[PDB]
Amino acid sequence: NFGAILS
Amino acid sequence: NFGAILS
Amino acid sequence: NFGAILS
Amino acid sequence: NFGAILS
Amino acid sequence: NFGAILS
Amino acid sequence: NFGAILS
Amino acid sequence: NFGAILS
Amino acid sequence: NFGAILS
């Protein structure tokens, strides 16, 4: 389970 | 704005 | 299960 | 605005 | 379940 | 408005 | 506004 | 459960 958010 | 979810 | 949103 | 879902 | 909402 | 639901 | 829900 | 909200 891996989550990544770029902004 | 870029979002990515891996599972 | 992979989800990606670009904006 | 571009969205893509892979499963 | 995958759900996405963009305004 | 853009709305999408996958299940 | 960007909203996303995964489950 | 994965949930994300961006304004």
Side-chain angles (χ1 to χ4, degrees):
Chain A
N1 289 341
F2 171 61
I5 298 171
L6 284 155
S7 201
Chain B
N1 289 341
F2 171 60
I5 301 302
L6 284 155
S7 308
Chain C
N1 289 341
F2 171 60
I5 296 169
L6 283 155
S7 282
Chain D
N1 289 341
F2 171 61
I5 299 302
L6 284 155
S7 315
Chain E
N1 289 341
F2 274 57
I5 193 66
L6 302 178
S7 201
Chain F
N1 289 341
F2 274 58
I5 297 169
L6 302 177
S7 53
Chain G
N1 289 341
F2 273 58
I5 296 169
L6 301 177
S7 49
Chain H
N1 289 341
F2 274 58
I5 193 66
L6 302 177
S7 287

